[PDB]
Enzyme design. Structure first.
Site, PDB file in Angstrom:
ATOM      1  N   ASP B  22    -140.628 -76.293 -17.429  1.00 19.91           N
ATOM      2  CA  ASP B  22    -140.117 -75.972 -16.169  1.00 19.91           C
ATOM      3  C   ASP B  22    -138.548 -76.070 -16.079  1.00 19.91           C
ATOM      4  OD1 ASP B  22    -139.446 -75.687 -13.462  1.00 19.91           O
ATOM      5  OD2 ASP B  22    -141.233 -76.728 -12.855  1.00 19.91           O
ATOM      6  N   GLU B 114    -137.861 -88.723 -11.908  1.00 19.12           N
ATOM      7  CA  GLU B 114    -138.447 -87.605 -11.678  1.00 19.12           C
ATOM      8  C   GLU B 114    -140.087 -88.114 -11.073  1.00 19.12           C
ATOM      9  OE1 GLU B 114    -140.937 -84.202 -12.848  1.00 19.12           O
ATOM     10  OE2 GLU B 114    -141.301 -85.123 -10.986  1.00 19.12           O
ATOM     11  N   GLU B 123    -150.186 -88.650  -6.696  1.00 22.15           N
ATOM     12  CA  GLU B 123    -149.741 -89.677  -7.738  1.00 22.15           C
ATOM     13  C   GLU B 123    -149.173 -91.073  -6.900  1.00 22.15           C
ATOM     14  OE1 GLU B 123    -147.868 -88.296 -11.766  1.00 22.15           O
ATOM     15  OE2 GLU B 123    -147.390 -86.298 -10.424  1.00 22.15           O
ATOM     16  N   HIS B 274    -143.388 -75.687 -11.662  1.00 17.68           N
ATOM     17  CA  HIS B 274    -144.814 -75.924 -12.072  1.00 17.68           C
ATOM     18  C   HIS B 274    -145.876 -76.714 -11.039  1.00 17.68           C
ATOM     19  CE1 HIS B 274    -143.112 -80.191 -12.828  1.00 17.68           C
ATOM     20  NE2 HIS B 274    -144.484 -80.404 -12.728  1.00 17.68           N
TER      21      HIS B 274
HETATM   22  N1  LIG Z   1    -144.778 -97.715 -12.244  1.00 17.26           N
HETATM   23  C1  LIG Z   1    -144.405 -97.122 -13.446  1.00 17.26           C
HETATM   24  N2  LIG Z   1    -143.711 -97.599 -14.283  1.00 17.26           N
HETATM   25  C2  LIG Z   1    -143.024 -97.043 -15.357  1.00 17.26           C
HETATM   26  N3  LIG Z   1    -143.408 -95.771 -15.587  1.00 17.26           N
HETATM   27  C3  LIG Z   1    -144.269 -95.062 -14.672  1.00 17.26           C
HETATM   28  C4  LIG Z   1    -144.776 -95.520 -13.374  1.00 17.26           C
HETATM   29  N4  LIG Z   1    -145.434 -94.791 -12.866  1.00 17.26           N
HETATM   30  C5  LIG Z   1    -145.502 -93.598 -13.552  1.00 17.26           C
HETATM   31  N5  LIG Z   1    -144.657 -93.719 -14.753  1.00 17.26           N
HETATM   32  C6  LIG Z   1    -144.348 -92.794 -15.627  1.00 17.26           C
HETATM   33  O1  LIG Z   1    -143.337 -91.763 -15.101  1.00 17.26           O
HETATM   34  C7  LIG Z   1    -143.495 -90.582 -15.454  1.00 17.26           C
HETATM   35  C8  LIG Z   1    -143.206 -89.433 -14.507  1.00 17.26           C
HETATM   36  S1  LIG Z   1    -143.205 -87.695 -15.194  1.00 17.26           S
HETATM   37  C9  LIG Z   1    -141.424 -87.436 -15.564  1.00 17.26           C
HETATM   38  C10 LIG Z   1    -141.320 -87.823 -17.033  1.00 17.26           C
HETATM   39  C11 LIG Z   1    -139.805 -87.624 -17.564  1.00 17.26           C
HETATM   40  N6  LIG Z   1    -138.822 -88.274 -16.519  1.00 17.26           N
HETATM   41  C12 LIG Z   1    -139.502 -86.018 -17.524  1.00 17.26           C
HETATM   42  O2  LIG Z   1    -138.797 -85.384 -16.861  1.00 17.26           O
HETATM   43  O3  LIG Z   1    -140.305 -85.526 -18.507  1.00 17.26           O
HETATM   44  C13 LIG Z   1    -144.810 -90.396 -16.483  1.00 17.26           C
HETATM   45  O4  LIG Z   1    -144.558 -90.303 -17.859  1.00 17.26           O
HETATM   46  C14 LIG Z   1    -145.320 -92.015 -16.229  1.00 17.26           C
HETATM   47  O5  LIG Z   1    -146.267 -92.404 -17.371  1.00 17.26           O
HETATM   48  C1  LIG Z   2    -153.315 -88.630 -10.513  1.00 25.90           C
HETATM   49  C2  LIG Z   2    -152.873 -87.959 -11.638  1.00 25.90           C
HETATM   50  C3  LIG Z   2    -153.769 -87.683 -12.939  1.00 25.90           C
HETATM   51  O1  LIG Z   2    -152.279 -86.647 -11.121  1.00 25.90           O
HETATM   52  C4  LIG Z   2    -151.507 -85.842 -11.905  1.00 25.90           C
HETATM   53  C5  LIG Z   2    -151.715 -84.689 -11.559  1.00 25.90           C
HETATM   54  C6  LIG Z   2    -150.760 -83.434 -12.507  1.00 25.90           C
HETATM   55  C7  LIG Z   2    -149.878 -84.010 -13.505  1.00 25.90           C
HETATM   56  C8  LIG Z   2    -149.105 -82.914 -13.971  1.00 25.90           C
HETATM   57  C9  LIG Z   2    -149.540 -81.956 -14.758  1.00 25.90           C
HETATM   58  N1  LIG Z   2    -148.667 -81.049 -15.082  1.00 25.90           N
HETATM   59  C10 LIG Z   2    -147.305 -81.777 -14.776  1.00 25.90           C
HETATM   60  C11 LIG Z   2    -147.570 -82.873 -14.274  1.00 25.90           C
HETATM   61  C12 LIG Z   2    -146.598 -83.848 -13.581  1.00 25.90           C
HETATM   62  N2  LIG Z   2    -145.819 -83.243 -12.574  1.00 25.90           N
HETATM   63  C13 LIG Z   2    -146.476 -83.029 -11.274  1.00 25.90           C
HETATM   64  C14 LIG Z   2    -144.628 -83.896 -12.435  1.00 25.90           C
HETATM   65  C15 LIG Z   2    -144.669 -85.424 -12.025  1.00 25.90           C
HETATM   66  N3  LIG Z   2    -143.417 -86.018 -12.003  1.00 25.90           N
HETATM   67  C16 LIG Z   2    -149.730 -85.243 -13.534  1.00 25.90           C
HETATM   68  C17 LIG Z   2    -150.537 -86.298 -12.897  1.00 25.90           C
END
Ligand SMILES: Nc1ncnc2c1ncn2[C@@H]1O[C@H](CSCC[C@H](N)C(=O)O)[C@@H](O)[C@H]1O
Ligand SMILES: CC(C)Oc1ccc(-c2c[nH]cc2CN(C)CCN)cc1
Ligand SMILES: Nc1ncnc2c1ncn2[C@@H]1O[C@H](CSCC[C@H](N)C(=O)O)[C@@H](O)[C@H]1O
Ligand SMILES: CC(C)Oc1ccc(-c2c[nH]cc2CN(C)CCN)cc1
Ligand SMILES: [Cl-]
Ligand SMILES: [Cl-]
Ligand SMILES: [Cl-]
Ligand SMILES: [Cl-]
Ligand SMILES: [Cl-]
Lengths: 333, 332
Positions: B22, B114, B123, B274
């Site tokens: 993305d 993010e 989430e 996305h």
């Molecule tokens: N309470 C918490 N403490 C630490 N990490 C967490 C959390 N809840 C969710 N996460 C983490 O937060 C991430 C959000 S997705 C974003 C991932 C990264 N910043 C990127 O841009 O690619 C996930 O990988 C998940 O494992």
């Molecule tokens: C309850 C959980 C499994 O729900 C999810 C549903 C979808 C995803 C997911 C699929 N492709 C990319 C993402 C993450 N994205 C939404 C950005 C997050 N900062 C992750 C968790």
């Protein structure tokens, strides 16, 4: 637990799956013409449609002159098939019967059986034993089965889509100024290291050798029911066309309708127009480089799982050229 | 135990491939961090939910002397690999475990994250970030992004219109009339109470999109207000004649400047992401005309059984038709 069957039929109670099947033009038109060309065996005759779904195949049989069609359906979609039959004015000729074909009681033997029983890799869902059980019980001696036969094929593949997914991590620097090349191994373990059968469309350019037929199912043959439990398949062998990273194997099937005219084949090969079946892909744990005339050989068996009999299991043993023989056990997604 | 199953979803590569691919998302985070290079030079940063570590490395590239990259799922090992590989082991420390229970050596001058799910709050990651602000962010600290707005509009989904109309087309394709199944099709596809994540175009939008919530993330007491529900009332007038299939919701977030402020939108009038949009279908189509009154209320909640799954209570009224209610849950 015969309540495993209730969760299976709940899929077929929904509209989406039937939309996907009827929208599959290749599939639905193969059945249309396949039925039409066998008019001589169908005019005036009685027909059993095993798993009628929305009732489309039963109507094809009536339109080809059948005097009576028994449309047996195990899910709640039977209500919609009765409605469709009534809507086309065919209630006097097409009769929809609820419940599994194993327990169904017809008033008579039938002249012909039609069924669309093929799952992914042909035998996912394990619907073939129902069709064969119904043949033995209800089909008259030398009656028509449609389709009449099936074949399975295997071939080594280099999946270009997967290649770009694995290569993605090396492209990261040029876009975002951060080097993520070191995650190529991790991505390989995630996407290739698992033991699931991936259902994905391939191009013909992803094929690395002559496809080899490893099974041939003549559906009239008595005792075929018993062989499905022991497994379907056997050995294969082929030499590769050229240089490529081999990611694994694809498998696909075909089924044949007789003529009356010539035979009609419905194929799910990547050299033919796509279907909703796509291809079943069996990835190695990591890629392997092959060259022109690298001999690939091995052993493959298709059979149902221990946990869920409807789920498909694939035991593969393979040898890539010089390398030692390796093994891998797969199960449908 | 329940939270462990959620983290495991981020252990696979596919989810991170999708987020980094993305470009709109990742460029907005890159450029948003870069805009505040002045405020970040020689400062310390917390990256909540570091994933593969890409956002932490943007902060190190922007001039931060120290970045703590907190990641609860097994993917933290991949983030450690990427840091060492990029020669940033001195400047970026990957700390495994949840951000609630992590122990940093100091308070931080900025938090990057993010956290946005489908329909923004799927989430329920925002609570983790707001708890991390209270515990670890200094006074006058920086939040990237800083705010969020939520939008809603009546829509006419063409993909759905095609799937409903399909059963009338069977006669032309195959010589069997299945037009009688249209009602059944509608009950399956629209009668289900689930939030559909799908991308829309501008043609699908039937009225002026309406904002129904603003979230200033610095606001205290916001953590409690998330459990009670985020939402509001809305009214709009339809542009012209169309069949209305439901509502689309989407969001935007804003990064502060340091230069003009950067806005990351998931609107269908801006480039695709996305996240797409989140669709809320009616039980059947409702034919609308120009200046038709659509009004209602929406509330985004955590689900009863599963707190991380997004729930949407919708009250809606369309023209002369009476006020109707529908409870949605995010795609299973
Ligand atoms: N309470 C918490 N403490 C630490 N990490 C967490 C959390 N809840 C969710 N996460 C983490 O937060 C991430 C959000 S997705 C974003 C991932 C990264 N910043 C990127 O841009 O690619 C996930 O990988 C998940 O494992
Ligand atoms: C309850 C959980 C499994 O729900 C999810 C549903 C979808 C995803 C997911 C699929 N492709 C990319 C993402 C993450 N994205 C939404 C950005 C997050 N900062 C992750 C968790
Ligand atoms: N043992 C059994 N007895 C009766 N129906 C069965 C069955 N096993 C599977 N089925 C049904 O067989 C159908 C297989 S799909 C084929 C559907 C239909 N011929 C069409 O083209 O639209 C499903 O509707 C499924 O519910
Ligand atoms: C529930 C699991 C075991 O079985 C299914 C797996 C896949 C499907 C499915 C999805 N789209 C179309 C189909 C049916 N199709 C393969 C032709 C069937 N003769 C249905 C059941
Ligand atoms: Cl059912
Ligand atoms: Cl009937
Ligand atoms: Cl065949
Ligand atoms: Cl292997
Ligand atoms: Cl905002």
């Amino acid at each position: 637990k015969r309540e495993r069957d209730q969760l299976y039929y709940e899929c077929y109670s929904d509209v989406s799956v039937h939309e996907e099947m009827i929208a599959d033009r290749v599939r639905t038109d193969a059945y249309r013409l396949g039925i039409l060309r066998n008019w001589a065996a169908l005019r005036g005759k009685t027909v059993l449609d095993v798993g009628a779904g929305t009732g489309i195949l039963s109507i094809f049989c009536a339109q080809a002159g059948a005097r009576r069609v028994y449309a047996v359906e195990a899910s709640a979609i039977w209500q919609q098939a009765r409605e469709v039959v009534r809507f086309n004015g065919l209630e006097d000729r097409v009769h929809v019967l609820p419940g599994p074909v194993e327990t169904v009681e017809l008033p008579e033997q039938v002249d012909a059986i039609v069924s669309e029983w093929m799952g992914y890799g042909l035998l996912h869902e394990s619907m073939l034993s129902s069709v064969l059980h119904a043949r033995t019980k209800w089909l008259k001696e030398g009656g028509l089965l449609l389709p009449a036969s099936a074949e399975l094929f295997i071939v080594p593949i280099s999946d270009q889509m997967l290649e770009w997914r694995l290569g993605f991590w090396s492209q990261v620097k040029q876009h975002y100024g951060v080097d993520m090349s070191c995650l190529e191994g991790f991505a390989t373990r995630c996407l290739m290291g698992h033991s699931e059968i991936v259902v994905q469309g391939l191009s013909g350019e992803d094929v690395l050798a002559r496809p080899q037929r490893f099974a041939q199912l003549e559906l009239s043959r008595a005792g075929l029911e018993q062989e499905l439990e022991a497994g379907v398949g056997g050995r294969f062998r082929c030499s590769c066309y050229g240089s490529a990273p081999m990611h694994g194997f694809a498998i696909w099937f075909q089924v044949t309708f007789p003529g009356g005219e010539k035979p009609l084949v419905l194929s799910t090969s990547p050299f033919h127009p796509a279907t909703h079946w796509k291809q079943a892909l069996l990835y190695l744990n990591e890629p392997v480089q092959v060259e022109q005339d690298t001999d690939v050989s091995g052993e493959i068996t298709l059979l149902p799982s221990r946990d869920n009999p409807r789920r498909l299991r694939v035991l593969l043993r393979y040898k890539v050229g010089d390398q030692e023989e390796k093994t891998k056990d797969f199960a449908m997604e």
